[PDB]
């Protein structure tokens, strides 16, 4: 079949999906594709090269709210930007994972740039808004991880009989969002307080 | 070699650390301890049990700050839970992740029952105190896997430039403190507030 990028990504994601991360190998994608392993080659190089393409492309297709809207608050873009990281990492199996393994490549460059510069342009210094964002991506990486590494290795006291039961409600969102507040709210505090003692 | 339980994890640790967790495996354990492969067998079915009790024994091992001391605060009891979970994670290659995919097992059910029972008794909700304790268990792995994930796959513009530079000062230990911080603050104000609108 179609061996441009944008093919060979889209088949790759959906192998994702059939195979998680840890069964996604070269091998199975040139099956997927109709085609021999040397041919795969001249295109996709290894695993490696695949998994870094799939985490941009993961979020160049459904993070749909990586820049902040003209007007909005950083709090506002914070918790916006959180919610849709957090759906694109949930879109496909090992999602979290896929994106763990990368740093931002060209393409994202400039929109961490225009991410880094809004929090400036709020009053954080580089350091405290880059902290800020980074306890973000890490707070919701590491509770999708969750979700995501639960389910994967699936295939009491009292207290903890019910936190296991209300820690299953729904997938996380509620812990996440309630986190994610708390998290945006130790912000505004410290922000805030510029060189007061807080 | 000695194939008891205590034995067996302890090479399975050091393996890891020669290996990493995707690296990791039951042939390769069997050959570190001079023993065949169906003699590992008897005593460690598969790949999973291993990891599984591996996840086990790294807190068990190096988690030293399971339990609040006498008197002490939730605030400084959480402080101090994140940053030895966060030591514990790090110890070991791939740490993070050999954590991520389990439960709590039998002897850490009365850990984390305490801890649930302790946050109730200082004015949470069963609710929000595992809000408030996922959220820094979140937190730490996501912080935690970003550095071990960073360096397991090594293996511009001017602010984000710049970011990176600052991102790589020490290992993340400032971001995630700072970051922590902010979390903690933020259960607190809506400790706090009760039902007063926050
Ligand atoms: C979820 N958001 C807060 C960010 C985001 O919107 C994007 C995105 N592509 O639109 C990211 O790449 C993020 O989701 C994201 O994962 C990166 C992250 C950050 C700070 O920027 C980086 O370039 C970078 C890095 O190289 C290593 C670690 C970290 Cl935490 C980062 C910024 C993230
Ligand atoms: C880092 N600390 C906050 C906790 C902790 O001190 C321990 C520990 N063994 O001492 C945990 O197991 C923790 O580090 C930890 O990883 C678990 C975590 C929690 C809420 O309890 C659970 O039993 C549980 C679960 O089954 C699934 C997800 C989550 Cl977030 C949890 C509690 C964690
Ligand atoms: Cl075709
Ligand atoms: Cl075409
Ligand atoms: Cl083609
Ligand atoms: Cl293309
Ligand atoms: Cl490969
Ligand atoms: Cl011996
Ligand atoms: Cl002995
Ligand atoms: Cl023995
Ligand atoms: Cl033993
Ligand atoms: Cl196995």
Redesign the interface.
Known sequence: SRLNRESVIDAALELLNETGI?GLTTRKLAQKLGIEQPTLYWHVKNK?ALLDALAVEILARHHDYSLPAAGESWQSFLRNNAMSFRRALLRYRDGAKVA?????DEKQ??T??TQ??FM?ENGFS???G???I??V???????V??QQ??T??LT?????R???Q??DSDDGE???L??L???????E??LTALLQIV
Do not use: C, K, N, W
Not at 137 to 143: D, E, I, K, M, V
């Open positions: 840890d490696r763990l393994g990368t740093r931002p460059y400039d961490v740039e880094l510069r400036t580089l350091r405290d880059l902290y800020a980074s306890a991506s890490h707070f919701t990486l590491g509770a991880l969750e590494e639960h994967a290795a009491l006291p009292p207290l903890l019910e936190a296991l209300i820690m509620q812990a996440f309630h986190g507040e708390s998290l945006i709210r130790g912000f505090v410290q």
